[PDB]
């Protein structure tokens, strides 16, 4: 009846009497909204006001549920909250609010005549209040709130916790919900006009606070403190007040860790290993303790005093480093909301992209050589910050020019368009006409390049592009402003391509950039983990506030000098429309004009540097066309990250050289830069490190930037990853399980489970209790993703319903008199969540026939084809190998409903969704566009591939066109081009072709078994021998290096059993990854390898034609021949598991690390690929079941059919 009284809520296992009950109740929550209003607003829940309990570190705390009068009694709409200028050309200059002010939802009245400025303004404010607030990831917002509340009820087994009283006091207005959303109108329709305007965001706020409670980050009293602070921020304007105190509520942790005094922390090696632990001091130097006064005063005058009192409580009652970590994660949950921050871009445009000047003006380099238009070709700095950056950068120009000379730049431009263009899109579908006739409607850059390919070599294309405006497109991300990003056409993108190509080469010449390390695991933070285990070290996470708005035109000239130096030194003809030639030129000192030989790249770079226009133009519904002031940096450009990286590394390393030439030492060890993120590490005395850090700050101030100097002894930040004393403090409130950037229907819903599993795996080491997060994901799959509606034919209605209702539960409609083919509602069973190609979600214990249970699958269990082993684990696999059978117990698999899920994934019913239909161009036009596009760089590679593909075709071995290299560009143009500007939505239904297999596959439907899934039949017996732990198990028992890896936890014990991750410990690499995945990159389930192995088993004279048609190089040719040779011998067994680097973050990627834990009898080693296969068996079993692992040694037993399958 109720979810906190089921037998699953008390046992957390699935019997046959408990799984059907959860299936029924989650179906009742997923189907109708009357039951959702009944569940969220039951009468039996008493409203609590005062409350008592523990904090995140176990100390008693008392809070009171408080809701201000401005939320229950909202003010009326004030039109001076969004003022205009006198001309009414744009909003007013200093305007207080950029986001949705809180008011009564019916108070906003568009009483103006149409085609008026006030009419446009109030229509846009209606769009702000009704459209910009619906941000839901999986389902409607009330279903997501039902998922959070259901998870909390089943976990805590009671219904009296304060978030229920918050939900009832904020959202119970009558006998219906106060608002709802419709995907047909794409807006939030209000039912109660008396409710507040910001009130539909608090459903998502309550979802995030419940996620934080499920995480173990917030307790219930801390959830009271969090919700009181969010309503206090919503008292006037919620997003503005959140952004105003976003840093004050976080930056106290340095003072807290100072007052801790001593910490026993782990010690990291150079080679990614925990080698010991030390006991260090955590007191701070005196220039850090001077900032504490300003932070205390600003904290006392700015923050809500309940949250301020919680922060002072965290300052006092912390004794370890883990105490400060727990209170810091609590304050991250208390200040961040999870929702993506979004309003009208006219409101955030003046704060995201408007240029600004800070500290001082940047002057110019002396122009040494000059064009006849007096435009600069060569220049040099007299003295100042340009001279300091160039003193370091000018030593790289000759090597970079040597590297640039060996690149074909036309093929590089075409590869840049096909792969990783910076805006990724033209932001809108545009009309494509050349000779007075339109060609296509498209938004891809490669179809745009294929259309205007006749003028790729024409110089007037560049000047034609200088006439076009630079487009503006907005962004969402949580805990951050709206961040308008620019978009520009292919020719303005082409002007910035050679500066990008030049500045890209310096990454291969230094070690002071961070591009090489984004792998999703603990290799990304290894240098911080090393340098924070050191002593006499000063850490500096120096932050430049608003860098793209701070780069002026003269600041761009600093990088332009470096680009012009490299461009003058190189020898590159034929870049674009440009070609190397003698050119009339001016020089300083020379009164007349000289003649110099100028190559193509230096022409392109000089013409780009001399014709600079940044200002983005936005097309507004209120004001028409809005332009920006100039002197920003466009950031939808080719060289956007490389510019800031090169400039910052030049300023820092040139300041090191400048201090050397002034007679001062350097204490700088490493720097890491990725554009607007600098990470400086100094080592030495406090005097020298303070002097060098102050000099770097002053030389950034001299370059025209404003800097906030957060510099510490024991904490470092880079790329939103915080390391404190050899320990990773993850940021769990940067991942939103509930909101999105864009509103988008799901349709496929296997993709929805893949997205949910990826987000759950991203929240895995940055969380404190992963088991409640597993329950939360189970309920958001059981409520949010459980509904499917499909249109079914009228004559075919009853025979479809009666056949499908034997295995599933289906909701049917009465009639359809007015139209044909009414739609049928079917809800999928909960067994679909745990299936191969279904949900692939970790499962709870299922009961066998004997009363034994399967294993509670942990957060480290593999996905992919390894989920099929649960079908055999439920079938009592130990009993099934002790009487030598392979019979799946289809009766028990039917009573849990696995066979309906497998019938559903077999019949492909969940593919029949609505589909946006594009109206394509003629295929003769497609061939013409691709043939014209091939003539732009590296002639002759694709027509040879087409010739060899036709040669394979005539000998009777046809290749598919998505594998042939001469094709595919045809396929890309065919996908992304249209002959019209509008698209239609086509729905799908069941017809006789699908009804025939509905009738055929639903008579008995035994679950099929292949001959190859005998490899699942293996088990592990527990011996009384206790394994030894790794020696770093004692070094991580003090001050855990993740929030889930505390002493005693399963992540800690998995690290203590399997060890850490290593890049050089590849014991078996070919034989493991062969039966798991690929050979090196070519997986066996690729059409490339499959068609190649077909032509390999056939005559070998056609093989070289296969190599020419794929057009692979000779090294890949040899690798792929060895791939066929390794598949032909010992390629029959294969196992296909899937893990993730965010999932196995600190843990090892190697299955060989489990061979010390499991005793395998030597009579099973009957093939050369048994060893790695059994290592994978042991490794996946040990990761799958860490929760019941008490440190005993395992013994593996195998099935005789498994031995017979591995022998042959």
């Amino acid at each position: 009846t109720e979810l906190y009284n089921t037998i699953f809520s008390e046992t957390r296992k699935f019997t046959r009497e408990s799984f059907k009950e959860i299936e029924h109740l989650t179906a009742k929550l997923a189907n109708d909204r009357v039951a959702r209003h009944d569940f969220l607003f039951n009468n039996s829940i008493a409203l609590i006001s005062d409350y008592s309990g523990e904090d995140s570190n176990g100390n008693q705390l008392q809070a009171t549920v408080t809701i201000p009068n401005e939320i229950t009694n909202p003010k009326e709409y004030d039109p001076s909250d969004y003022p205009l200028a006198e001309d009414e050309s744009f909003f007013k200059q200093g305007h207080k609010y950029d986001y949705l002010v809180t008011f009564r939802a019916g108070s906003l009245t568009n009483t103006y005549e149409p085609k008026t400025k006030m009419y446009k303004l109030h229509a846009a404010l209606d769009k702000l209040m009704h459209v910009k607030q619906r941000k839901s990831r999986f389902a409607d917002l009330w279903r997501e709130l039902c998922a959070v509340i259901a998870s909390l009820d089943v976990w805590y087994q009671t219904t009296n916790y304060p978030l229920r009283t918050y939900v009832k006091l904020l959202f119970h207005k009558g006998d219906e919900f106060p608002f709802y959303e419709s995907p047909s109108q794409d807006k939030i329709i209000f039912n109660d006009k008396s409710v507040a305007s910001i009130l539909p965001t608090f459903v998502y706020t309550c979802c995030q606070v419940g996620t934080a409670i499920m995480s173990g980050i917030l307790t219930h009293v801390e959830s009271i403190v969090a919700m009181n602070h969010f309503l206090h921020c919503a008292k006037d304007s919620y997003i503005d007040e959140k952004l105003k105190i976003k840093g004050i509520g976080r930056s106290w942790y340095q003072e807290a860790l100072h007052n801790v005094g001593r910490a026993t922390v782990p010690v990291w090696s150079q080679f990614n290993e925990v080698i010991g632990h030390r006991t260090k001091t955590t007191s701070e130097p005196h220039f850090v303790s001077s900032t504490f006064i300003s932070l205390r005063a600003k904290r006392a005058e700015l923050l809500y005093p309940e949250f301020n009192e919680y922060i002072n409580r965290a300052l006092r009652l912390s004794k370890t480093q883990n105490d400060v970590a727990n209170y810091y994660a609590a304050c991250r949950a208390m200040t961040n909301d999870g929702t993506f921050l979004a309003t009208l871009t006219e409101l955030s445009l003046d704060a995201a992209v408007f240029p600004r000047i800070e500290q001082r003006l940047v002057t110019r380099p002396a122009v040494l050589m000059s064009n006849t238009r007096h435009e600069s070709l060569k220049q040099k700095y007299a003295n100042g910050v340009g001279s300091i950056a160039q003193s370091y950068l000018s030593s790289f120009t000759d090597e970079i020019a040597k590297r640039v000379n060996g690149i074909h730049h036309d093929e590089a431009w075409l590869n840049f368009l096909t792969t990783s263009s910076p805006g990724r899109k033209l932001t809108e579908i545009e009309k494509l006409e050349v000779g007075g006739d339109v060609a296509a409607w498209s938004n891809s850059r490669i179809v745009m390049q294929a259309v205007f390919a006749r003028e790729y070599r024409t110089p007037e294309r560049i000047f034609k592009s200088l006439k076009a405006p630079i487009k503006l497109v907005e962004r969402q991300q949580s805990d951050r402003r709206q961040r308008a990003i620019s978009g520009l056409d292919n020719d303005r993108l082409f002007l910035s391509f050679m500066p990008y190509t030049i500045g890209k080469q310096i990454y291969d010449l230094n070690d002071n950039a961070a591009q090489g390390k984004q792998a999703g695991n603990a290799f990304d933070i290894g240098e911080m983990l090393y340098w924070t285990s050191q002593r006499n070290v000063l850490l500096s996470s120096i932050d430049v506030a608003g860098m793209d708005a701070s780069v002026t035109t003269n600041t761009k000239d600093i990088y332009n000098t470096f680009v012009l130096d490299v461009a003058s030194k190189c020898t590159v003809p034929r870049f674009g429309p440009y070609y190397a030639k003698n050119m009339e030129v001016f020089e300083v000192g020379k009164r007349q004009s000289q003649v110099k030989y100028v190559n193509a790249a230096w022409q392109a770079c000089a013409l780009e540097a001399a014709n600079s226009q940044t200002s983005t133009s936005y097309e507004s519904e209120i004001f028409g066309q809005v332009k920006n002031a100039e002197g920003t940096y466009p950031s939808g450009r080719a060289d956007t990250s490389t510019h800031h990286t090169v400039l910052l590394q030049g300023l820092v390393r040139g300041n090191e050289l400048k201090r050397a030439s002034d007679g001062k030492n350097s204490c700088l060890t490493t720097i890491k830069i990725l554009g607007d993120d600098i990470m400086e590490i100094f080592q030495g005395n406090e005097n020298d490190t303070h002097d060098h850090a102050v000099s770097n700050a002053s030389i950034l101030n001299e370059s025209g930037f404003a800097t906030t100097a957060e510099l510490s002894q024991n904490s470092i930040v880079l790329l939103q990853q915080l390391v404190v004393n050899g320990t990773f403090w993850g940021f769990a409130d940067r991942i939103s399980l509930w909101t999105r950037e864009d509103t988008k229907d799901i349709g496929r819903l296997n993709l929805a489970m893949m997205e949910l599993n990826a987000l759950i795996d991203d929240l895995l080491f940055r969380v404190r209790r992963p088991e409640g997060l597993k329950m939360l994901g189970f309920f958001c799959g059981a409520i949010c993703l459980r509904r499917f509606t499909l249109s079914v034919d009228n004559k075919l209605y009853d025979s479809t319903y009666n056949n499908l209702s034997k295995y599933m539960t289906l909701v049917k409609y009465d009639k359809n008199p007015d139209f044909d083919s009414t739609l049928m509602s079917l809800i999928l069973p909960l067994a679909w969540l745990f299936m191969p190609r279904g949900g692939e979600y970790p499962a709870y214990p299922f009961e066998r026939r004997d009363g034994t249970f399967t294993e509670d699958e942990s957060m480290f269990t593999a996905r992919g084809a390894y989920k099929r082993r649960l079908l055999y684990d439920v079938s009592n696999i130990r009993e099934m190998i002790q009487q030598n059978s392979m019979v799946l117990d289809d009766d028990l698999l039917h009573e849990y409903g696995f066979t309906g899920a497998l019938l559903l994934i077999d019949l492909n019913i969940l593919d029949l969704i609505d589909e946006v239909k594009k109206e394509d161009i003629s295929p003769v036009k497609v061939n013409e566009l691709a043939t014209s596009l091939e003539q732009l760089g590296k002639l002759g590679e694709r027509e040879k591939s087409r010739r060899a593909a036709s040669d394979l075709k005539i000998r009777g071995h046809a290749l598919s066109n998505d594998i042939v290299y001469g094709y595919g560009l045809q396929e890309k143009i065919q996908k992304s081009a249209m002959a019209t500007k509008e698209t239609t939505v086509q729905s799908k239904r069941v017809s006789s072709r699908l009804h025939e297999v509905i009738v055929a596959k639903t008579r008995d439907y035994k679950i099929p078994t292949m001959p190859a899934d005998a490899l699942h039949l293996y088990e592990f017996e527990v011996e009384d021998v206790t394994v030894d732990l790794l020696p770093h198990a004692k070094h991580t028992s003090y001050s855990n290096l993740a929030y889930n890896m505390s002493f005693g936890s399963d992540g800690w014990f998995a690290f203590a059993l399997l060890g850490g991750l290593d890049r050089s410990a590849n014991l078996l690499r070919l034989d493991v990854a062969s039966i798991r995945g690929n050979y090196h990159k070519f997986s066996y389930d690729d059409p490339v390898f499959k068609q190649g192995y077909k032509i390999y088993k056939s005559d070998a004279t056609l093989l070289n034609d296969f190599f020419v048609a794929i057009s692979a190089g000779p090294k890949e040719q040899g690798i792929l021949l060895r791939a066929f040779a390794y598949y032909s011998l010992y390629g029959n067994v294969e196992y296909h598991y899937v893990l993730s680097p965010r999932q196995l973050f600190f843990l090892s990627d190697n299955p060989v690390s489990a061979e010390r834990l499991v005793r395998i009898p030597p009579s099973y080693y009957v093939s050369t690929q048994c060893r790695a296969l059994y290592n994978i068996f042991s490794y996946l079993h040990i990761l799958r079941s860490i929760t019941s692992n008490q440190g005993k040694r395992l013994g593996m037993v195998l099935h005789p059919g498994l031995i017979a399958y591995v022998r042959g």
Binding site: E86, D87, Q93, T553, R591, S615
Partner: protein, 501 residues
């Protein structure tokens, strides 16, 4: 083989001073190149304006070493047709692709020739002042070679070995073409026709050459005339072809005037100016503004006033024009009033010459603090000594651009641009590129150059010329050429080329 066919586009070559020799192996070669141009246009019209193998076409035409012969046929049909055409020429080598080094020539090259340039070493002919040198092999072999008549050269054509079928005539005698044609026996010859002028002046550092887009009759100047005589026509239509600083001054006289080819405007300049004119015309834009940067001393207000008048006449709208010292002459009056006025007529009334600027007062006090009072004192310093003072001038400049207060410059241009009675289209002048964050929101900012040695115009004037030269050098140190460079005749040609109504 030229990039542009002379047998078809003969008038474009007549513009350059090049006349076809009348109708030998060169005579056969130019017809062969015409046939190749026609065949290339036919093959390019069938596949999206492109050629299917431009390296193959380039080898067949320029090297002449490739025969494609049918012994797919569909993929190589055009190459077989081009092969049978080039094979029948029976040339000992190929036809080299020939390009002039002019921008007006390069804009008129067809697309398929541009596709062939990337796979060919072309023969590039340099241009001195927009005129290709007539001593090249191809220009001597295909065209008539010009002969210049001057005041000392002048005689009957029988005195030299001149003939109508070989030479063309450049009349530089200062006399009428009819008088030379009937009085000295040049009746059967063809005269080359130029529409502009080239003037050589006397300079401070030497002599200065100036190209002017007016005729010698319209520009009423003779040898010996002063620089200030007919100054405004020179300013509106002239470009100095020398390095900066070119020592032109008010004391310059004319050494020589000859007829010369007219300059063609740049493509990027006309592009940015037509972007501004599109903003002026369109009804979707509420306010349109052109920011024009120039060096202090260029005479930019005198041009931009006439530019604003011509834009009002060709457009039909009211054009506002703030000077470059507008905020300075405002702040020299209103830096103490708590709520000062921002009305356009008041600020426009403060733009007169007899109002002192705020930055001029601060720079004059800064010069007095170093004992500088004279131009001879200021010129006698070293470069480091000057830069040490310009850093202090940048410190007094940064206080007015750093924030948005009521007397800030950003708020000044905000409250002028978004006023009630201010005109829709504004033209605002600036001194340096750091005002891009401060002048009102535009999409078109250009940089202006004139015929003015700015450091010579500043030392040849009164009312605190030391402060004027100091501010010129400070603003030069803050203003590179990082926006598109536009001359005055280009800004007039932009208005003349825009189709109105």
């Amino acid at each position: 083989m030229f990039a542009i066919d002379p047998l078809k586009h003969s008038k474009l070559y007549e513009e350059y001073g090049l006349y076809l020799r009348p109708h030998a192996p060169t005579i056969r070669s130019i017809k062969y190149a015409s046939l190749i141009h026609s065949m290339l246009a036919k093959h390019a019209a069938r596949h999206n304006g492109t050629l299917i193998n431009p390296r193959m076409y380039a080898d067949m035409i320029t090297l002449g070493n490739t025969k494609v012969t049918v012994t797919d046929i569909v993929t190589y049909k055009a190459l077989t047709e081009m092969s049978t055409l080039i094979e029948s020429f029976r040339l000992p080598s190929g036809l080299a692709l020939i390009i002039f080094d002019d921008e007006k020539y390069q804009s008129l090259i067809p697309n398929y020739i541009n596709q062939l340039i990337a796979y060919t070493q072309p023969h590039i002919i340099p241009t001195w002042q927009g005129i290709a040198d007539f001593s090249d092999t191809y220009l001597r072999s295909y065209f008539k070679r010009p002969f210049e008549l001057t005041a000392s050269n002048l005689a009957a054509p029988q005195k030299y070995n001149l003939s109508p079928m070989t030479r063309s005539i450049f009349n530089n005698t200062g006399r009428e073409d009819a008088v030379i044609r009937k009085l000295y026996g040049y009746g059967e010859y063809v005269f080359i026709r130029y529409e502009g002028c080239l003037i050589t002046w006397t300079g401070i550092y030497g002599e200065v050459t100036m190209m002017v887009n007016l005729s010698k009759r319209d520009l009423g100047l003779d040898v010996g005339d002063d620089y200030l005589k007919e100054y405004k026509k020179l300013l509106f239509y002239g470009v100095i072809t020398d390095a900066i600083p070119s020592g032109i001054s008010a004391r310059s006289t004319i050494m020589k005037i000859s007829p010369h080819k007219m300059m063609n405007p740049s493509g990027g300049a006309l592009a940015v100016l037509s972007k501004f004119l599109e903003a002026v015309v369109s009804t979707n834009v509420i306010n349109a503004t052109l920011v024009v940067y120039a060096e202090k001393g260029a005479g930019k207000t005198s041009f931009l006033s006439t530019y604003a008048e011509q834009l009002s006449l060709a457009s039909g709208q009211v054009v506002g024009h703030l000077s470059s010292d507008a905020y300075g002459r405002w702040l020299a009056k209103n830096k103490d009033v708590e709520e000062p006025s921002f009305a356009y007529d008041y600020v426009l009334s403060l733009d007169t010459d007899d109002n002192e600027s705020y930055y001029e007062q601060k720079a004059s006090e800064l010069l007095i603090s170093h004992g500088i009072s004279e131009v001879a004192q200021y010129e006698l310093l070293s470069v480091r000594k000057k830069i040490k003072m310009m850093d202090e001038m940048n410190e007094v400049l940064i206080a007015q651009l750093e924030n948005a207060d009521t007397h800030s410059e950003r708020n000044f241009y905000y409250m002028v641009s978004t006023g009630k009675t201010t005109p829709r289209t504004l033209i605002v002048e600036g001194h340096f590129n750091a005002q891009d964050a401060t002048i009102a929101r535009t999409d078109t900012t250009v940089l202006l150059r004139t015929i003015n040695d700015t450091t010579q115009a500043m030392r040849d004037r009164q009312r605190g010329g030391v402060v004027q030269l100091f501010l010129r050098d400070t603003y030069y140190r803050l203003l590179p050429a990082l926006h598109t460079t536009v001359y005055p005749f280009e800004m007039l040609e932009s208005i003349r080329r825009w189709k109105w109504v």
